[PDB]
Tab-separated table of C-alpha atoms (C1' of nucleotides) and ligand atoms in Angstrom:
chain	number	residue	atom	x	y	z
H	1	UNK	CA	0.000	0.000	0.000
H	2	UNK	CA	0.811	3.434	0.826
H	3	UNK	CA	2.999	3.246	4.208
H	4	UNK	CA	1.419	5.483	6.803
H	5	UNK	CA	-1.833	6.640	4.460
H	6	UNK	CA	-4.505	5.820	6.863
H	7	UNK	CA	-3.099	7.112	9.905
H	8	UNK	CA	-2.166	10.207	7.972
H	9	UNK	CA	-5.591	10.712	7.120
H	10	UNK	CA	-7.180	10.178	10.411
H	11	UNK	CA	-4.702	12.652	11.803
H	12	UNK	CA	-4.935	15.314	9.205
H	13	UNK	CA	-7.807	14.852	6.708
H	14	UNK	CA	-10.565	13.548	9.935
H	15	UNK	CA	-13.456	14.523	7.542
H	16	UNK	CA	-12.848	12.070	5.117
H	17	UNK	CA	-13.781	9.595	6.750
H	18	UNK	CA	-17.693	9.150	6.831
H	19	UNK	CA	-19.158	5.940	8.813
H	20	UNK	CA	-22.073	4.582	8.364
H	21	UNK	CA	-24.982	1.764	9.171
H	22	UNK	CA	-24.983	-1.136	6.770
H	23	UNK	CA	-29.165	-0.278	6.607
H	24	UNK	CA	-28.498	2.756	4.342
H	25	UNK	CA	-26.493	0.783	1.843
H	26	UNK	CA	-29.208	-1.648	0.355
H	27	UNK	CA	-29.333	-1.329	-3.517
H	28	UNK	CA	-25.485	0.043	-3.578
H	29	UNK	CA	-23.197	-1.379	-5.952
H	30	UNK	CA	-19.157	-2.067	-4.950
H	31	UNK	CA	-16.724	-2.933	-6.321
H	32	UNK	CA	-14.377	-5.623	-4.121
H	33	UNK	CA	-9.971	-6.587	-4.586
H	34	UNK	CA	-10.785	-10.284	-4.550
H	35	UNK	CA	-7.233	-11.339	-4.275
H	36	UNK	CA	-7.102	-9.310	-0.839
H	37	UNK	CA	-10.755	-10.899	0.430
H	38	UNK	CA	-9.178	-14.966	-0.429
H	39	UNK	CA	-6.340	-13.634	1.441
H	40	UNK	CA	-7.566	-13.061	4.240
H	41	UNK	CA	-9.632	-16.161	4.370
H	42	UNK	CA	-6.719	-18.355	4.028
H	43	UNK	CA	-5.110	-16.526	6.532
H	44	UNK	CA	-7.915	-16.441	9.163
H	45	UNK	CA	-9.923	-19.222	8.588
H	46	UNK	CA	-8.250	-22.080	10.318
H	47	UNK	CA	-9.266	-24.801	13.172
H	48	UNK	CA	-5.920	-26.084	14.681
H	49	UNK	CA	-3.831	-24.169	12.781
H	50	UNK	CA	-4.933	-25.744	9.604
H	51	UNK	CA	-7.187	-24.651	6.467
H	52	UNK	CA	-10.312	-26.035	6.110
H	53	UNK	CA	-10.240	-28.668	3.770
H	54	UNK	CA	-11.912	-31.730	1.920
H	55	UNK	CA	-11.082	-35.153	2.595
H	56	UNK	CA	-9.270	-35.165	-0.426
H	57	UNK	CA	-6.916	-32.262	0.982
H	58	UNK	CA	-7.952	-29.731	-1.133
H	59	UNK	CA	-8.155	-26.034	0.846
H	60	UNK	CA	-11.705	-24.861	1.570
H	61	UNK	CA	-11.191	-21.795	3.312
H	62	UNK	CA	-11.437	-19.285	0.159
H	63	UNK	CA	-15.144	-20.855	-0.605
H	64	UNK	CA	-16.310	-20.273	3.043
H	65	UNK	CA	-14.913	-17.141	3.027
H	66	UNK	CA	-16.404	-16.315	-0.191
H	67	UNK	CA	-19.783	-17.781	-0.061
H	68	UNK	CA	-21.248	-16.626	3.095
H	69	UNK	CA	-19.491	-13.204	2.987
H	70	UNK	CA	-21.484	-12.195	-0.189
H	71	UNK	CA	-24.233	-13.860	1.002
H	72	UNK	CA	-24.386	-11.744	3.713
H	73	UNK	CA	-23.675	-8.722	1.573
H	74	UNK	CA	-26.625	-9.473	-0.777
H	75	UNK	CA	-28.917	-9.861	2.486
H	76	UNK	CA	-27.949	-6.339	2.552
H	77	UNK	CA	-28.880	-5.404	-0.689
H	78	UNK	CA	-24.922	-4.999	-1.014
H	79	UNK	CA	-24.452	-6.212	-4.635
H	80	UNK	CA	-20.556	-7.104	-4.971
H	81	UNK	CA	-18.472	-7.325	-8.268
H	82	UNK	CA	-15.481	-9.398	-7.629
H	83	UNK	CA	-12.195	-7.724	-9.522
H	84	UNK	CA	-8.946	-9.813	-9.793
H	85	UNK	CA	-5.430	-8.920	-10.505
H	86	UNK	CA	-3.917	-9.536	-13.777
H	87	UNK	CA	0.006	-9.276	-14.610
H	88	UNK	CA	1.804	-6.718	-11.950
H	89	UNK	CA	3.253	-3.546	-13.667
H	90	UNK	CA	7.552	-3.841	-14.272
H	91	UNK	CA	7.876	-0.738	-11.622
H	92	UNK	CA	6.761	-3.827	-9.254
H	93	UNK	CA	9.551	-6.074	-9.685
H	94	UNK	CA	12.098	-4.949	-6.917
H	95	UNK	CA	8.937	-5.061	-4.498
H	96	UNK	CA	8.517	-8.669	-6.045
H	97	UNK	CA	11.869	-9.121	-5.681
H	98	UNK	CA	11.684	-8.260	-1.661
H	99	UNK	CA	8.164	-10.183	-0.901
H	100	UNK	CA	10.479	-13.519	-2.481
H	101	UNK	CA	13.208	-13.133	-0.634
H	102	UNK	CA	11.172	-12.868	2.668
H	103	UNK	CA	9.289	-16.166	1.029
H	104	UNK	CA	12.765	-17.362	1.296
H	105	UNK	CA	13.247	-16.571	4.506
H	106	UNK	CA	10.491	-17.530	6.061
H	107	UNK	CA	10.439	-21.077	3.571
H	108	UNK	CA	13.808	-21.646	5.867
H	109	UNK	CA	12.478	-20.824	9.429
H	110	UNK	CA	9.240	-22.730	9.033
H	111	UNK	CA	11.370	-26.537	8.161
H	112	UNK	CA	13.198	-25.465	11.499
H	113	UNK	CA	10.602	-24.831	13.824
H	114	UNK	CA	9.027	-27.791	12.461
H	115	UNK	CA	11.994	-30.031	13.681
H	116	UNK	CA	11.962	-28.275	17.001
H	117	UNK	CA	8.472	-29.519	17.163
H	118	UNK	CA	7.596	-25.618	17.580
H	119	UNK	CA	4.216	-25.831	16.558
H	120	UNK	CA	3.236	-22.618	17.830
H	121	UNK	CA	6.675	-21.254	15.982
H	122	UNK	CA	5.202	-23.585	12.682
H	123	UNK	CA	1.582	-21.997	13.182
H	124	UNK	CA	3.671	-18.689	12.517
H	125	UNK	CA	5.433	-19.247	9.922
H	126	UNK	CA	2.807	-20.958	7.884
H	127	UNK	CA	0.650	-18.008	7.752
H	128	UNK	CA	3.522	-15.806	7.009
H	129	UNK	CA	3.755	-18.624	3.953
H	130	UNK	CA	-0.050	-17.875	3.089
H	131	UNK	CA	-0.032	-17.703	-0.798
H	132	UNK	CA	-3.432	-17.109	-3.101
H	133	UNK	CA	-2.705	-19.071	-5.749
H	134	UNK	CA	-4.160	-19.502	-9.846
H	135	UNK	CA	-6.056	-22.316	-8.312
H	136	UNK	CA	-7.538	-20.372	-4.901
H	137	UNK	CA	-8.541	-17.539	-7.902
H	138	UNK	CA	-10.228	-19.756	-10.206
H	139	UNK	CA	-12.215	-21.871	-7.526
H	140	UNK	CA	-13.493	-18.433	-6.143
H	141	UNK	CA	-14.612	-17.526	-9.737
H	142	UNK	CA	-16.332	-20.932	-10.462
H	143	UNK	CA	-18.552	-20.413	-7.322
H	144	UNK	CA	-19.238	-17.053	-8.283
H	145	UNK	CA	-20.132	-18.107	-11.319
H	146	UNK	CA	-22.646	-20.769	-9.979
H	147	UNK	CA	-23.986	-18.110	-7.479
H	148	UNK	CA	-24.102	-15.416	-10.015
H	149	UNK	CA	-22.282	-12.745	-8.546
H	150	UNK	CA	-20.523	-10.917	-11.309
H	151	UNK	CA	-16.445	-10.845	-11.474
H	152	UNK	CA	-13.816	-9.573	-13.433
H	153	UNK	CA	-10.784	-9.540	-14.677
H	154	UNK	CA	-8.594	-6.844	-14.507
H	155	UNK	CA	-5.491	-6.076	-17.196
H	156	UNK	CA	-3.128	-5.532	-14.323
H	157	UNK	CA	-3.426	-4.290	-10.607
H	158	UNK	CA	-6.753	-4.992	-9.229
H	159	UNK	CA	-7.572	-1.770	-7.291
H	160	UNK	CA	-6.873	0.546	-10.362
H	161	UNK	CA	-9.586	-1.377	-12.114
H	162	UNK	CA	-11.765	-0.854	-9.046
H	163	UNK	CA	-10.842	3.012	-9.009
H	164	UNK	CA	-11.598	2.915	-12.637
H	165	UNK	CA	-15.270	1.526	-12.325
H	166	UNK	CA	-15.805	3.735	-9.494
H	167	UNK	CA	-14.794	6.746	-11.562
H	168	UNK	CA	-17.313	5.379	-14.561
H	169	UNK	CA	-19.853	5.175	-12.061
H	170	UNK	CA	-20.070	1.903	-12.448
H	171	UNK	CA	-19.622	1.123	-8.606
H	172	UNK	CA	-20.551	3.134	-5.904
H	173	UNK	CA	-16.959	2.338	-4.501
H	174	UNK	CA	-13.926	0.032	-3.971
H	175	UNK	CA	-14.032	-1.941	-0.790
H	176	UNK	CA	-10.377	-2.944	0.272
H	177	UNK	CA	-8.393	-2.030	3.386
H	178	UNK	CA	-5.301	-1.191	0.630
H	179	UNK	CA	-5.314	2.728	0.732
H	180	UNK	CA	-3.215	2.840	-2.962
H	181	UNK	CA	-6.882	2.321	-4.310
H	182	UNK	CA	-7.150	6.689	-3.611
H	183	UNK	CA	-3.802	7.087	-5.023
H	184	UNK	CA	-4.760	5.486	-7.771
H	185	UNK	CA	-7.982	7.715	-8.226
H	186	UNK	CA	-10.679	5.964	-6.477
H	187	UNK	CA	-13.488	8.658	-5.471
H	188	UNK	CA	-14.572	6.618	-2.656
H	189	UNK	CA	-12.939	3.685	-0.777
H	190	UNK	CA	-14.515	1.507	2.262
H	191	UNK	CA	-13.248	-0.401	4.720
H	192	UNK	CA	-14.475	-3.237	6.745
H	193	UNK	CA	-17.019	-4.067	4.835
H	194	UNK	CA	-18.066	-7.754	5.797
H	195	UNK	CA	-21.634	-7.319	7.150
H	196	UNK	CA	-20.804	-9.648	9.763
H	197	UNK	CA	-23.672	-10.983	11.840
H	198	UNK	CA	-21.135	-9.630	14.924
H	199	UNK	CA	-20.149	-6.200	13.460
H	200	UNK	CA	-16.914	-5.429	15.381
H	201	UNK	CA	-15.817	-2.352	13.237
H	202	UNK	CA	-18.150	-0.083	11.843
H	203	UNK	CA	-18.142	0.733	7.859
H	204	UNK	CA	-16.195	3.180	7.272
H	205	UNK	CA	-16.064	5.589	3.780
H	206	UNK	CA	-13.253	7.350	2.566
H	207	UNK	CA	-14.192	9.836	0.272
H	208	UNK	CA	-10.763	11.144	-2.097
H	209	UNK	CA	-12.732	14.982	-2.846
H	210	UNK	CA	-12.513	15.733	1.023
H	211	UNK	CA	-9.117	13.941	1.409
H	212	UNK	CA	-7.878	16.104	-1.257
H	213	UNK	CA	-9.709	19.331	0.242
H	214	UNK	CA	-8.237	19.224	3.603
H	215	UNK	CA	-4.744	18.751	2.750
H	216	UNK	CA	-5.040	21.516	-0.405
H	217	UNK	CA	-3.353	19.150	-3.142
H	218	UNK	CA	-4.712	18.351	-6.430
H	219	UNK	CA	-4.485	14.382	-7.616
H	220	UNK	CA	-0.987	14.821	-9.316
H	221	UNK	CA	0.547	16.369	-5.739
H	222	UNK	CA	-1.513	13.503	-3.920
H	223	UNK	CA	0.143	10.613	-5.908
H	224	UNK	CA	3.569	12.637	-4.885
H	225	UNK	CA	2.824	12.251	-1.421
H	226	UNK	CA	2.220	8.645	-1.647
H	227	UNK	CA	4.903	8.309	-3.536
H	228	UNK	CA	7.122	10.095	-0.751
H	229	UNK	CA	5.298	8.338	2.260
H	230	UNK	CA	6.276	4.804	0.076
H	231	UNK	CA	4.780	2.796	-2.015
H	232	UNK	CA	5.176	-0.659	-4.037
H	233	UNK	CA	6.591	0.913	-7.128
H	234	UNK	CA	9.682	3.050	-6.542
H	235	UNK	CA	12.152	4.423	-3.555
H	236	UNK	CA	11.112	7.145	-1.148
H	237	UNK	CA	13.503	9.883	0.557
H	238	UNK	CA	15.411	8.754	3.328
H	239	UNK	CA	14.886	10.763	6.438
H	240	UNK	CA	11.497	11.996	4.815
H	241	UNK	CA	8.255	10.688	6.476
H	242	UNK	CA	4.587	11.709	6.614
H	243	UNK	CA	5.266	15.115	8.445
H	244	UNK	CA	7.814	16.397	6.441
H	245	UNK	CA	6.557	15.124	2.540
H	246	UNK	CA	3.527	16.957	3.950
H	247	UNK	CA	5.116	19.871	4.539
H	248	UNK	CA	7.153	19.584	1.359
H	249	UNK	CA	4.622	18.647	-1.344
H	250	UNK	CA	2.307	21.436	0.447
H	251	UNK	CA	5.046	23.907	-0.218
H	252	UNK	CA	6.944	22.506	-3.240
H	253	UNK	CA	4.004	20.846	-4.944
H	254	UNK	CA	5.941	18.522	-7.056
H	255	UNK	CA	8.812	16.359	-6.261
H	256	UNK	CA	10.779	17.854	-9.496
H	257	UNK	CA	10.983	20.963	-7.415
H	258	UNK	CA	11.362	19.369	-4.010
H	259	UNK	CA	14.822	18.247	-5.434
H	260	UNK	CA	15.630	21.114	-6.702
H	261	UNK	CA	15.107	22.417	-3.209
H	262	UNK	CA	16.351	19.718	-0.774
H	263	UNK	CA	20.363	19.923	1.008
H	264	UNK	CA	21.923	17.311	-1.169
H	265	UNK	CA	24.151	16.605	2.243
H	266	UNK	CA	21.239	16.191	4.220
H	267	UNK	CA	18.790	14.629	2.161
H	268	UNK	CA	20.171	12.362	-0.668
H	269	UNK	CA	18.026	11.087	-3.278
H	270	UNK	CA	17.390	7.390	-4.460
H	271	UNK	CA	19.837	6.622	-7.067
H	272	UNK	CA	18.387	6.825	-10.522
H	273	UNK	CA	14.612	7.096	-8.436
H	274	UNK	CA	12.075	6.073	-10.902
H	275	UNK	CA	9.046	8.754	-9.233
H	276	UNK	CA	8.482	10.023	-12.213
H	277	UNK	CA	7.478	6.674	-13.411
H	278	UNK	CA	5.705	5.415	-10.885
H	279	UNK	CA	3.955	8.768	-10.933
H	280	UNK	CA	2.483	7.820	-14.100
H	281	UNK	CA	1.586	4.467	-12.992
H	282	UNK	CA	-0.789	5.700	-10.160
H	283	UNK	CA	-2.267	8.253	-12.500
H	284	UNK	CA	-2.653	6.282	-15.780
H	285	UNK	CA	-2.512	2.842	-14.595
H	286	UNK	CA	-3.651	-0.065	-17.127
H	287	UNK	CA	-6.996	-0.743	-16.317
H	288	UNK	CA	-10.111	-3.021	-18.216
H	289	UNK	CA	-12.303	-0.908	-19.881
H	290	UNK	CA	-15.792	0.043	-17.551
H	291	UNK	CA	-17.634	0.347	-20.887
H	292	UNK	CA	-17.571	-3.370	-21.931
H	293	UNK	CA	-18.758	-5.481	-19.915
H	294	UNK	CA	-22.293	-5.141	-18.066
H	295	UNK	CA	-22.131	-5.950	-13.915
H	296	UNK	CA	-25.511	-7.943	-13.669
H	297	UNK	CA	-26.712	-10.300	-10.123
H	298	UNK	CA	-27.875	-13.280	-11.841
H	299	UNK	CA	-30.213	-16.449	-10.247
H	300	UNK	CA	-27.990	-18.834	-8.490
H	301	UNK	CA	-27.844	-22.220	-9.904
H	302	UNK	CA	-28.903	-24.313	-6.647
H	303	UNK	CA	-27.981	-27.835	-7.715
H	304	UNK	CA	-24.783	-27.317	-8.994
H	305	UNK	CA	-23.879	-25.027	-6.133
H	306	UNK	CA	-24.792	-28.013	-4.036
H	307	UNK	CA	-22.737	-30.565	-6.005
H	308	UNK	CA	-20.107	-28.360	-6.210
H	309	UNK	CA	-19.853	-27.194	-2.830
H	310	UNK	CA	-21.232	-30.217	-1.362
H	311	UNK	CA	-20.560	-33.448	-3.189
H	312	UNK	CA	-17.033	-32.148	-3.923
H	313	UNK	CA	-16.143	-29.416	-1.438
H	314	UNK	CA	-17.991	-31.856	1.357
H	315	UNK	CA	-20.320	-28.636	3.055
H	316	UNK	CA	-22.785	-29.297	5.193
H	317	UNK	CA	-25.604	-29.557	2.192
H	318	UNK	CA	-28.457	-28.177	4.845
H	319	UNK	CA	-26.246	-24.899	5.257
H	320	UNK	CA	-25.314	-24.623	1.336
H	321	UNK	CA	-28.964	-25.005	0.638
H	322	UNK	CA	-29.820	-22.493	3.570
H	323	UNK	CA	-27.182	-20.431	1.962
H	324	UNK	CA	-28.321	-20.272	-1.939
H	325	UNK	CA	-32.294	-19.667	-0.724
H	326	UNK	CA	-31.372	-16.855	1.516
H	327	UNK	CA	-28.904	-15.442	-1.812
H	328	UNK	CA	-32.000	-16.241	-3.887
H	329	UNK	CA	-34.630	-14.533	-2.016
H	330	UNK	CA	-32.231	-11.502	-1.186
H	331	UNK	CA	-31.555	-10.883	-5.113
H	332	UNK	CA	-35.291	-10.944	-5.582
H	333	UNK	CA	-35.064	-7.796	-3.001
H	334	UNK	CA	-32.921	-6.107	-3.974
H	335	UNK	CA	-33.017	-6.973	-8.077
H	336	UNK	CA	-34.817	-6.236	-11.022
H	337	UNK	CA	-35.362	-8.396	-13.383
H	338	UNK	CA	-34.099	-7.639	-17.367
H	339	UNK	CA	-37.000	-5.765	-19.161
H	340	UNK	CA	-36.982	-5.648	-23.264
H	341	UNK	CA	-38.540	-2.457	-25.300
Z	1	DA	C1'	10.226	18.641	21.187
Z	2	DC	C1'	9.475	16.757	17.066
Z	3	DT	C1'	10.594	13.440	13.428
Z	4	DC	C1'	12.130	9.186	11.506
Z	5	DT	C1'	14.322	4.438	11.340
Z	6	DG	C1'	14.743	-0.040	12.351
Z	7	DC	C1'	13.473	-3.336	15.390
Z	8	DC	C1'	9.901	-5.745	17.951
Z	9	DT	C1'	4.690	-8.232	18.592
Z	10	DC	C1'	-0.186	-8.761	16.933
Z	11	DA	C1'	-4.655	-9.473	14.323
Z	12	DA	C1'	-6.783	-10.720	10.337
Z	13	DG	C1'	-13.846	-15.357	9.099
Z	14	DA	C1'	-18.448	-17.290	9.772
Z	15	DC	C1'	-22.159	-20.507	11.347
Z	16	DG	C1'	-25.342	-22.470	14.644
Z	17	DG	C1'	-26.973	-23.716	19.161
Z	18	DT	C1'	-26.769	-21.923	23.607
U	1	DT	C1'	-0.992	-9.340	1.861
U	2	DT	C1'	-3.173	-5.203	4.601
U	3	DG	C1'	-3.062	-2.782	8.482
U	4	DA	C1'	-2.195	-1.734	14.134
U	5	DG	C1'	1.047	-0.538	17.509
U	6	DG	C1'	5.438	-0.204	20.541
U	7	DC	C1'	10.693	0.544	21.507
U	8	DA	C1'	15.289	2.964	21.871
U	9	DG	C1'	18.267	5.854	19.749
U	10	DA	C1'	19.773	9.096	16.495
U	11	DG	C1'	18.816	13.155	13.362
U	12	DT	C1'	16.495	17.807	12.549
C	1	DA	C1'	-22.323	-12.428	22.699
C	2	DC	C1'	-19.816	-16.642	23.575
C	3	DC	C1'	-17.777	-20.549	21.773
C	4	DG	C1'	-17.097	-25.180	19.522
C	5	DT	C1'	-16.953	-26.202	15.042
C	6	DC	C1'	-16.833	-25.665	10.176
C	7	DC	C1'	-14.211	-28.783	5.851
Y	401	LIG	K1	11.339	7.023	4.092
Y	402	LIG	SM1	-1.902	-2.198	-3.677
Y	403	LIG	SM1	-3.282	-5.878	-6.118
Y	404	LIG	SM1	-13.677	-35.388	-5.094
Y	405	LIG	SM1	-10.990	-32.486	-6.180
DNA sequence: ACTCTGCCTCAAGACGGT
DNA sequence: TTGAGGCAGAGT
DNA sequence: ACCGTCC
């Protein structure tokens, strides 16, 4: 993400951030980072440490995640379009570079602490090992499929695709908890939304027009400060955090001039720094085209949700069934069906 | 006093019966 | 993966 | 809401 973005925010942009009660949001449209939602399935969902799983040890954690969650969403009147990442932009190889290398790392201390019979050292490790995988993505889209919740694939980084639809008005807004979905245009982000049956945080809006009003930058100086605060795509300035780039893109505007400004002795900058590049990433990112396709909440196909998720994924078939009439009925809620002139 | 860095630890889901 | 925080200790 | 269990 953007290191130190949210905080940022909350400390000098309050206004920004609008909550509000999941009741006022039946009939919206958003647009959700699937990657980031599997993630965190595989990562929380376990029971001893382990994934859920078939008997034929194939991970089932995604398609609980994934199948109650936007169940619960569409009980709402939340209607989700699932976007997922396509092939990361160049400026994201060193980043790449430095998640593998921790992979590496981590690949080593896990076979260690499993020797050690560390199994509270293991638990760690395996979760630091957590992957989503070609596999995890299209198992996720298959259900979707069958439950006909609409996904998509985007060109390269999922979030600009999300900004993108948001911007077409396609989506009312991107829900992820990765803030680089602003600085790469999003009008509106939320967080936490889940519409758990046992809320624990509250829904939370971030809206970019009062982000940019209270810190007085236009987009272009905006994608500057992330770009000084840190991001995935390029260096930042060493001794340079979120109080002074504030300070410094408020005053300089652009990080061409804040070079031309800054003590050389004091504050070096990267070595060949590619902002200027990454810069244009944030700004005109590759992104699918809103136009083309048509986001419609489709009937879900009961019987081969239940084969599927049953028969093969070995559910409980009383709470898939449960599951797919409560989707079914909540569509017809919130839904209207196609109409021909 | 204020800022930042580099080091540390920590959480992260949902259902059903009670 | 994304956050959240805390710590001392050094730089401004 | 708590908590054993989910697959
Ligand atoms: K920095
Ligand atoms: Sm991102
Ligand atoms: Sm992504
Ligand atoms: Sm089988
Ligand atoms: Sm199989």
């Amino acid at each position: 993400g953007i290191q130190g973005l949210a905080k940022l925010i909350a400390d000098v942009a309050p206004s920004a951030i609008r909550e509000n009660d999941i009741k006022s949001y039946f009939g919206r449209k958003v647009a959700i980072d699937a990657s980031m939602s599997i993630y965190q399935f595989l990562i929380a969902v376990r029971q001893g440490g382990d994934v859920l799983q078939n008997e034929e040890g194939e991970t089932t954690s995604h398609l609980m995640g994934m199948f109650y969650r936007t169940i619960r969403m569409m009980e709402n009147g939340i209607k989700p379009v699932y976007v997922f990442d396509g092939k990361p932009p160049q400026l994201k190889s060193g980043e790449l570079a430095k998640r593998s290398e921790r992979r590496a790392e981590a690949e080593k201390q896990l076979q260690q602490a499993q020797a050690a019979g560390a199994e509270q050292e293991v638990e760690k490790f395996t979760k630091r090992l957590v992957k989503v995988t070609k596999q995890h993505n299209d198992e996720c889209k298959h259900l979707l499929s069958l439950m006909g919740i609409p996904y998509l694939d985007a060109p390269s980084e999922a979030e600009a695709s999300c900004a993108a639809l948001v911007k077409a008005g396609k989506v009312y807004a991107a829900a992820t908890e990765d803030m680089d979905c602003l600085t790469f245009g999003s009008p509106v982000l939320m967080r936490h939304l889940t519409a758990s049956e046992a809320k624990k945080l509250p829904i939370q809006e971030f809206h970019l027009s009062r982000i940019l009003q209270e810190l007085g930058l236009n987009q272009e100086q905006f994608v500057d400060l992330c770009i000084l605060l840190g991001s995935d795509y390029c260096e930042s300035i060493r001794g340079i955090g979120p109080k002074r780039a504030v300070d410094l893109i408020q005053k300089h505007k652009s990080i061409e001039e804040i070079v031309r400004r800054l003590d050389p002795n004091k504050y070096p900058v990267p070595e060949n720094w590619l902002h200027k590049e990454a810069h244009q990433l944030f700004l005109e990112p590759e992104v699918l085209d809103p136009e083309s396709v048509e986001l419609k909440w489709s009937e879900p196909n009961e019987e081969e949700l239940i084969k599927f998720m049953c028969g093969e994924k070995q559910f409980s078939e009383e709470r898939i069934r449960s599951g797919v009439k409560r989707l079914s009925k909540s569509r017809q809620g919130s839904t209207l069906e196609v109409l021909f002139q």
